[PDB]
């Protein structure tokens, strides 16, 4: 859990919000993703079937309707969100090593910049998820007309309801994280002056 | 061949047109139908296939696109066209038997009425063929959306080109028969006065 709190962005300049609340939500998202990765999204493509005899229609329809899986999007989002925290940690380690082998304002500015970057990454991933999948709910039946499928074919999705439930959980957690990051930057600015 | 000439409508009041030309066309139609009945229309339904996994779609699509086979239509047309000729023949046999056990105008009127009825039957069968199958040509691929087929499916017809050739032959023969019957009634009316 210590590695998770390090990846959250806990810093000596962090207030209570960033130290005790943001890290817990980060760990919660990690745990939910670990639970839901291969249990419910494991057979997304192998169980995807269409009512046709045309060879190759299943694969092209699956690629058309799922350009990138939800789990992979959430994994990329978590990696990119955790990157600035470990960047700051490595910078702190470098500064301490330089001190050992031989100011606070630089640390403060680095912390606020990293928080802003985390907010930006969360916002852009929310926007791209909205672009790819406008509705939070997943449907049982889809209509596919991509070549080589003739006319329009019916295709069926695996576990729509469970995927909808986990999507709701993940989106709520991401929204809470965005709100907490905005509160963090506002609180730091207020404390500055 | 004598039975065929009897079924054509050969009568003692018949002129050359009805005695030597109409009967030959009748026999020609019979022979072409016998050749084409089971050779080319035999596998019309068993070889009819559609690109789908839906059970029962082949049968409903075949029934939708072929309400009655061409061969059965031609068989019914031949039977109904040959009916008045044998009706007249049985009436003549009855008259001769009555004469044996004990006028010409009755025979003349019966002959002209039978020719008119043959013309009407040929015309109505031509019209119903035009209603069911507007084009003389048969296509390779058809689009079917009848329940329970989902959306629209592609279905493939057996031997479209050979069926088109035989359809052209049969339609030309029927048209020639219609023209000859009209000429027969006109010639009989002219000879009457």
UniProtKB/Swiss-Prot annotation, chains A, B:
Effect of substituting residue 31 to I: In CMTX1; localized in the Golgi apparatus but also forming rare small junction-like plaques
Annotated phenotype, changing residue 32 to M: In CMTX1; localized mainly on the cell membrane forming gap junction-like plaques
Primary localization: membrane
Outcome after substituting residue 37 to V: In CMTX1; localized in the Golgi apparatus without reaching the cell membrane
Listed result of changing residue 125 to V: In CMTX1; uncertain significance
Transmembrane segments: 20-42, 73-92, 107-129, 168-190
Cytoplasmic side: 1-19
Result after altering residue 118 to E: In CMTX1; requires 2 nucleotide substitutions
Keywords tagged on the record: Cell junction, Cell membrane, Charcot-Marie-Tooth disease, Dejerine-Sottas syndrome, Disease variant, Gap junction, Membrane, Neurodegeneration, Neuropathy, Phosphoprotein, Transmembrane, Transmembrane helix
Consequence of changing residue 57 to F: In CMTX1; moderate
Outcome after substituting residue 82 to C: In CMTX1; mutant have a higher open probability than hemichannels formed of GJB1 wild-type
GO biological process: cell-cell signaling; gap junction assembly; nervous system development
Effect the entry attributes to changing residue 181 to I: In CMTX1; localized to the endoplasmic reticulum
A GO cellular component entry from the record: endoplasmic reticulum membrane
Entry's localization field: Cell membrane; Cell junction, Gap junction
Impact upon substituting residue 144 to R: In CMTX1; demyelinating form
Chain ranges on the Extracellular side, renumbered to this chain: 43-72, 130-167
Listed result of changing residue 91 to Q: In CMTX1; non-functional channel
Gene Ontology MF terms: gap junction channel activity; identical protein binding
Impact after mutating residue 61 to F: In CMTX1; moderate
Bilayer topology term: Multi-pass membrane protein
Subunit structure: A connexon is composed of a hexamer of connexins. Interacts with CNST.
Record-stated family: Belongs to the connexin family. Beta-type (group I) subfamily.
Disease: Charcot-Marie-Tooth disease, X-linked dominant, 1: A form of Charcot-Marie-Tooth disease, a disorder of the peripheral nervous system, characterized by progressive weakness and atrophy, initially of the peroneal muscles and later of the distal muscles of the arms. Dejerine-Sottas syndrome: A severe degenerating neuropathy of the demyelinating Charcot-Marie-Tooth disease category, with onset by age 2 years. Characterized by motor and sensory neuropathy with very slow nerve conduction velocities, increased cerebrospinal fluid protein concentrations, hypertrophic nerve changes, delayed age of walking as well as areflexia. There are both autosomal dominant and autosomal recessive forms of Dejerine-Sottas syndrome.
Protein function: One gap junction consists of a cluster of closely packed pairs of transmembrane channels, the connexons, through which materials of low MW diffuse from one cell to a neighboring cell.
Entry protein name: Gap junction beta-1 protein
Organism in which the protein naturally occurs: Homo sapiens (Human)
Primary gene name: GJB1
Portion of the parent chain present: 4 to 217 of 283
């Amino acid at each position: 859990t210590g590695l998770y709190t390090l990846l959250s962005g806990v810093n000596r300049h962090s207030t209570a919000i960033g130290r005790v609340w943001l890290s817990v939500i980060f760990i919660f998202r990690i745990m939910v993703l670990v639970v839901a990765a291969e249990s419910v999204w494991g057979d997304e493509k192998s169980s995807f079937i269409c009512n046709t005899l045309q060879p190759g229609c299943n694969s092209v329809c699956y690629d058309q309707f799922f350009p990138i899986s939800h789990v992979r999007l959430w994994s990329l989002q978590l990696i990119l969100v955790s990157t600035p925290a470990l960047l700051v940690a490595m910078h702190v380690a470098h500064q301490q090593h330089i001190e050992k082998k031989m100011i606070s304002g630089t640390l403060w500015w680095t912390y606020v910049i990293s928080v802003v970057f985390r907010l930006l990454f969360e916002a852009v991933f929310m926007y791209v998820f909205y672009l790819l999948y406008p509705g939070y709910a997943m449907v049982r039946l889809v209509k596919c007309d991509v070549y080589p499928c003739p006319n329009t074919v019916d295709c069926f999705v695996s576990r729509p309801t469970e995927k909808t439930v986990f999507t709701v959980f993940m989106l709520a957690a991401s929204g809470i994280c965005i709100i907490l990051n905005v509160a963090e930057v506002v609180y730091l600015i207020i404390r500055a002056c």
